[PDB]
Ligand binder design. Structure first.
Ligand SMILES: N#Cc1ccc(S(=O)(=O)O)cc1
Ligand SMILES: N#Cc1ccc(S(=O)(=O)O)cc1
Ligand SMILES: N#Cc1ccc(S(=O)(=O)O)cc1
Ligand SMILES: N#Cc1ccc(S(=O)(=O)O)cc1
Lengths: 729, 392, 391
């Protein structure tokens, strides 16, 4: 009933400045002194509580309100340090906190007076929820400003009235699909078109004057409804209809099944909770709907998935984009002209993301014909972006004009950054780099896009071994956000920093990995696909294997991924691992997946590149599982639970990540988590392959101890490769 | 305890969905017309003996709301002490009302009961009552809701029934329904619907297409290949039945039950109530069971019978694949299954189909002079009801 | 043949209508919470041996449509073989579910059955489902449709119950309801409603006004003046009861039943099914009847009279219906609705019959008495009645 969280016997910081003008318009300027961004913390709830108590006390002399900010952004984010420590016994405190917050916005919105949101910069999460409580929203059309409710990307939901208000404004379907389910971030112009914002202005200086102008005109033209939201009038009708209307009730039972289909069965509870609160709230009045939204919010905050997604997509990403794995005392070295060796899907994609970022790119291949078709990869990407309307002809032509196809080694004049993407062969990369190391600038970074071959052995083919470095991209390069920076034994600290800077310049995320056969991504993705092929040899139905991959949360099912990895490459990788052990005198213990791999090579089905893999391919498209697959491996003779298939894949990658951290391959769990999600596709609800252990949740318990207990269950039934390393015991 | 006997079992004709003859007739008028027919056949029946009226109704809303069983008691001039309860148990409602009537007599605390069902799907379509699930995405999400049409398609993919196999059964149902109508088999139990002036509205099951050919069925397009990914129900089905790769959509409007209007009434009572009113039993309720394919075995395990003891099997033709699986799983001889056609040809009025196909078996038992019939309903999934009757 | 016993009888508290604590809870969740309570009290129960779930529901539309009993079986994770059927017999639906479950036990073709009712009247008001005898003018005209409230005022007119007489009973129902709550009578049967976080939503019957006086009761204005002159229901009533001149309207919101939300569940099974599952019977279903002249029908069927009954439980739809029933069978004042009734605690249509049945199961045990009689929708019409024995 109060706007303050406590009502019994320290004190927070005041973050809102009170200015009332002559006409009676009060301006609320948010400015938290303890940060450059206004956030949803205790200092704000106390400050906004005082201002709301004061608007009610001085209601007889106040004629309108303007909500403004003094930072570069409007209001974005919350106190994640506090939310992540919310345990099940805290549900009472979480529920009461968001009820107080929303009661503050509820009083401001039913004040009987016009309230205008002067959105100067970015309003995200609680920021847009504050602006949604106002009656009119004007935004400054500026570079970098974003408006949206991205709570779902952290395993949460818009708990400060975002779900109830967007549903009341746009209806159930348009609110869920366009704003809530994916946490889409909008540009000020896009927000005006979808109704999130009403007017646009050119600069921030005009905002408060434009708001006060709107207040003055609103009190003159339409006084009866001044300060009244559409849903607080007698004749309100929800767009698209209430749940009990005939048009919406015909498709309503199909909303959860459509959501069950986008997630592919993955256990991510936030979108489910959003759809529930949206629909359940559209059945009652606003204040009851708002309270239902609090209860669904509290259950998500006290859960495990939210802690995993907050740990990964907030804290872990903070440390990476702050230079966590970058060397300390290194300066900036601008890049003039990039050289790419190889016009395959990798080199062409590398040239595209570099050109899109504004860099001059020289694309070299063994023939002009092949080089010209490599630049055609960017033509087809710019064609789609023109038809869809994401880029202009001016922007698109300048992008394509920074790519220069060539077949001549002498066209590498003045190149100070090499990125080789040729066939993965030890003595080919020696020949390719030998013809380039003397033509390029004497300070040129010499990068290699290698998946498994160690960089230390590759660097012996150039004279400046200090500037040879691994730069591992992921297909397709325009969509995959991670770059795996691999440090050889002779690679200097400056080369790491210069490639680190290049990764952020092209808009990707870098992890830093020490040199080892398989690096991190290729070694961990192999354990995932080798588990699935092991199940196929054991006799599990192939359809169950693929469902097990999707319901676990992976972006691509494992048998589909294997065809794209090519079984020929997978086989000679196992031959290299077998040689690296038999050369050290030891005896090689093969993976049971190697028998399946050799059988598909034996039957002439080595993957997608050869037109036949576990799937069939016709007209350049995947066309169903190969019918003869069930007879080759006697499918159906082994029917384990789906949760066991799911765990075998998740645990194989989690254990292998742990062994990568023990051997010094990775240097931090932040690199392991983000590198597993953005690199190989480990499910986002886990917070990463390392967070999967500390955050494990199963029917037997929670945490590292429960993970160890489950891995021992898997080991007793499926093989000793699931026995946890000694570093977990 | 006390044996429950069937004394009468009548039903309206089934009127089709589009341009149907029964679209103007309130569903309360469908029941009342059957109540008046029972008076015409037993004008000296003491209606104070009747102690309850149990009507099944899947969509008790609108014209079918407010306890339609009680409206019928009052609108038809039955005594106020004759009660009136509506129930809903999906496709099984018409048979659950009969079994509940039989159980109320077996308990000894009731003597004579009217049971049946009514459904005007052309005026109150399926789903009009809302749903404790569709208005609740959380429940819908967790229980993995799948409409029965997709599940029938999934049964055909798993059991191996092709598009020709389900069409072969649809052709069989239309042929046997036409022979039963031409043969006069339904002359004494299908009560023509008349208006307030006594003028004929409907006298036959107008959903029938007795000129059906194998080619006409092959030209129909799959009916649920447009609701599959439109709601994502094919993917939701395959997340549960994960060993299946692709659902074969073989069910069309020609091998699925028809959306029709109709009602049915059965008179259940004890032996003492029969002798006292001057009524001769037509059949006896031997056993009932509720389970879910396993309700058929549970009712046989209760009467001490096997498949070979039953002379007639009557399973609702909601979908062809459901009936075909039931046939293959219990090795049902083709000459014992839905001998007078089924819902594919004549229609499936949800709340009333149970009492409609029970009365179909009482008449066919007497026409053939056979002993036992087995009637089962809503078999698909977890629910399902079965009943065994013996000719008296 | 078999004997129907009661093994458990639980119910949610009853949340009021305006600013009600259960308004945010879906009715499906009200039932599931009571199912999970039975699990908490008998975790050893083989739910495969539960063969049906029968729920009373008078307005089965919207939140309460689509066979809400089947939804309860699915949403609570009960076996898919546990059935699920909804029924409607107006005010008696809850007790009709219990009696039907008892008859299904006696017939020998059912072993263990869950029965009860649910009704969220603040989310789905009565009449929301439609109905012919209200929305079909030909039938309505012929049967002389009159709401049950006008009929209650008519009863007070004929029988001669003054406004002072109905309000005096309304006070006793509030006093007995307060005494039962303060004495812990409801501690083990009223299961508080919690949300998905374990937070408390409601733990008491909100509709109660334990500080009621007869001066405040007299201040209330009659509740069905505007309805009787909206559609002329007084005139329609007096056309059939043509010997009475004017209806005396003595019923208000303080002497009629409250409009509330709630649910109740009763576990009914055979003697053999109880031994296997380690269940102790708490009561026995002696007889059930349907028709004042439904109470007699169940007395003759059980070979009992009024003197043999220890406690009488009549739903307090309106005060005059209970007073008339008291003078027709000479029911002593200390045997009639001993722990309050619907005037104080509310009348959640489809669930009331199953609620007041559980109230007598506990008062028999607490008083160490033999028999009790429960009846609803009474006064000729379409009434139901049941006699239970304590075991
Ligand atoms: N919003 C919010 C919120 C309030 C309290 C807590 S805590 O559990 O008390 O640390 C966590 C989150
Ligand atoms: N707690 C919390 C919280 C953090 C970030 C965001 S946002 O999605 O980045 O605007 C929203 C809520
Ligand atoms: N033989 C051959 C041949 C191959 C490539 C080219 S091209 O110059 O790269 O287009 C020209 C001739
Ligand atoms: N970088 C890179 C790269 C280039 C060619 C091939 S392929 O073996 O020719 O398909 C694989 C990787």
């Amino acid at each position: 009933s109060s706007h303050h969280h406590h009502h019994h016997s320290s004190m927070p910081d005041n973050t809102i400045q009170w200015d009332k003008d002559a006409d009676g318009i009060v301006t609320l300027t948010m400015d938290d002194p303890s940060g450059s961004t206004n956030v949803m913390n205790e200092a704000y709830i106390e400050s906004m509580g005082k201002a709301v108590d004061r608007l009610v006390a001085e209601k007889d002399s106040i004629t309108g309100v303007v909500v403004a900010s003094a930072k570069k952004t409007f209001f974005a984010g919350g106190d994640v340090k506090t939310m992540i420590q919310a345990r099940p016994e805290d549900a009472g405190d979480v529920f009461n906190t968001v009820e107080t917050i929303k009661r503050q916005l509820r009083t401001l919105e039913t004040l009987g007076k016009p309230v205008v949101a002067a959105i100067n910069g970015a309003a995200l999460g609680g920021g847009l929820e504050i602006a949604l409580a106002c009656h009119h929203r004007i935004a400054a059309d500026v570079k970098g400003s974003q408006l949206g409710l991205p709570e779902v990307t952290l395993g949460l939901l818009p708990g400060g009235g975002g779900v109830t208000r967007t549903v009341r404004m746009f209806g159930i379907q348009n609110a869920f699909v366009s704003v809530l389910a994916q946490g889409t971030r909008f540009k000020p112009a896009k927000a005006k078109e979808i109704g999130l914002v009403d007017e646009l202005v050119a600069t921030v200086e005009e905002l408060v004057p434009a708001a006060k102008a709107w207040i003055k005109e609103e009190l003159k033209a339409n006084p009866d409804g001044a300060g009244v939201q559409p849903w607080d009038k007698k004749g309100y009708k929800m767009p698209g209809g209430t749940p009990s209307s005939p048009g919406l009730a015909a498709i309503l039972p199909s909303f959860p099944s459509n959501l069950r289909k986008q997630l592919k069965g993955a256990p991510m509870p936030a979108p489910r909770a959003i759809l529930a609160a949206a629909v359940e709230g559209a059945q009652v009045d606003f204040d009851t709907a708002s309270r239902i939204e609090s209860r669904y919010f509290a259950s998500l905050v006290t859960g495990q998935v939210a802690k995993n997604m907050m740990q990964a997509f907030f804290f872990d990403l903070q440390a990476i984009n702050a230079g966590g794995s970058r060397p300390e005392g290194i300066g900036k070295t601008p890049i003039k002209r990039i050289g790419v060796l190889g016009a395959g899907m990798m080199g062409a994609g590398i040239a595209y993301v570099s050109a899109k970022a504004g860099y001059e790119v020289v694309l070299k291949d063994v023939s002009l014909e092949a080089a010209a078709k490599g630049k055609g990869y960017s033509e087809k990407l710019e064609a789609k972006a023109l038809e869809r309307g994401r880029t202009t002809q001016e922007r698109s032509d300048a992008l394509l004009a920074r790519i220069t196809p060539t077949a001549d080694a002498a066209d590498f004049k003045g190149v100070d950054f090499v990125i080789e993407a040729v066939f993965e062969n030890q003595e080919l990369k020696h020949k390719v780099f030998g013809e380039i190391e003397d033509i390029v600038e004497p300070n040129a970074i010499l990068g290699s896009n290698t998946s498994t071959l160690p960089i230390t052995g590759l660097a012996t083919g150039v004279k400046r071994q200090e500037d040879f470095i691994g730069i591992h991209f992921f297909s397709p390069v325009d969509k995959m956000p991670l770059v795996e920076i691999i440090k050889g034994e002779k690679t200097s600290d400056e080369a790491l920093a210069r490639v680190f800077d290049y990764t952020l310049a092209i808009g990707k995320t870098p992890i830093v990995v020490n040199d080892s056969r398989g690096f991190f991504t290729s070694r961990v993705i192999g354990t995932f696909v080798n588990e699935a092929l092991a199940m196929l040899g054991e006799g599990v139905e192939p359809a169950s294997i693929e469902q097990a991959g999707s319901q676990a949360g992976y972006p691509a099912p494992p048998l589909q991924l294997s065809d794209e990895l090519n079984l020929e490459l997978m086989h000679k990788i196992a031959v290299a691992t077998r040689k690296g052990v038999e050369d050290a005198g030891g005896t090689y213990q093969p993976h049971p997946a190697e028998a399946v791999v050799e059988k598909m090579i034996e039957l002439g089905r080595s993957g997608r590149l050869k037109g036949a893999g576990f799937y069939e391919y016709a007209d350049g498209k995947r066309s169903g599982l190969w019918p003869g697959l069930r007879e080759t491996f006697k499918s159906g003779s082994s029917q384990p639970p789906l949760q066991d298939m799911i765990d075998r894949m998740l645990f194989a990658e989690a254990l292998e990540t742990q062994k990568c951290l023990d051997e010094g391959v990775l240097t931090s769990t932040a690199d392991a988590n983000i590198g597993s999600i953005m690199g190989i596709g480990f499910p986002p609800w886990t917070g990463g392959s390392a967070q999967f252990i500390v955050g494990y949740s199963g029917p037997a318990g929670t945490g590292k101890a429960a993970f160890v207990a489950r891995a021992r269950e898997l080991a007793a039934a499926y093989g000793d490769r699931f026995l946890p390393p000694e570093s977990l015991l | 305890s006390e044996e429950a006997f069937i004394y009468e079992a009548i039903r309206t004709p089934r009127g089709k969905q589009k341009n149907g003859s029964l679209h103007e007739v309130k569903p309360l008028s469908l029941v009342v017309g059957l109540i008046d027919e029972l008076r015409k056949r037993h004008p000296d029946l003491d209606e104070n003996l009747i102690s309850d009226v149990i009507l099944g109704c899947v969509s008790p809303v609108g014209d079918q709301g407010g306890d339609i069983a009680r409206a019928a008691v009052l609108a038809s001039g039955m005594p106020v002490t004759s009660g009136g309860v509506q129930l809903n148990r999906f496709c099984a409602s018409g048979l659950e009302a009969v079994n509940t009537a039989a159980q109320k007599v077996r308990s000894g605390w009731d003597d004579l009961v009217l049971a049946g069902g009514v459904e005007s799907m052309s005026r109150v379509p399926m789903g009009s009552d809302g749903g404790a699930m569709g208005l609740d995405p959380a429940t819908n999400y967790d229980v993995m809701f799948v409409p029965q049409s997709i599940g029938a398609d999934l049964i055909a993919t798993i059991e191996g029934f092709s598009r020709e196999d389900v069409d072969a059964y649809a052709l069989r149902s239309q042929q046997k329904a036409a022979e039963a109508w031409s043969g006069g088999y339904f002359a004494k139990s299908v009560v023509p619907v008349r208006d307030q002036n006594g003028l004929l509205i409907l006298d036959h099951d107008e959903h029938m297409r007795p000129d059906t050919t194998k080619e006409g069925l092959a030209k129909l397009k799959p009916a649920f290949e447009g609701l599959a990914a439109l709601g994502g129900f094919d993917d939701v089905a395959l997340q549960k039945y994960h060993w299946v790769e692709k659902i074969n959509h073989v069910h069309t409007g020609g091998n699925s039950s028809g959306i029709v209007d109709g009602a049915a009434l059965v008179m259940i009572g004890s032996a003492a109530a029969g002798k006292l009113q001057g009524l001769t039993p037509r059949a006896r309720i031997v056993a009932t069971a509720t389970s879910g394919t396993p309700a058929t075995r549970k009712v046989l395990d209760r009467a001490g019978l096997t498949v070979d003891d039953i002379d007639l099997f009557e399973l609702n033709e909601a979908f062809a694949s459901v009936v075909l699986k039931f046939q293959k799983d219990l090795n049902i001889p083709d000459e014992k299954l839905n001998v007078n056609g089924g819902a594919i040809a004549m229609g499936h009025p949800l709340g009333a189909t149970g009492a409609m196909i029970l009365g179909t078996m009482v008449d066919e038992l007497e026409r053939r002079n056979a002993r036992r019939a087995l009637i089962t309903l809503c078999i698909g999934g977890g629910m399902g009801v079965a009943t065994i009757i013996e000719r008296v």
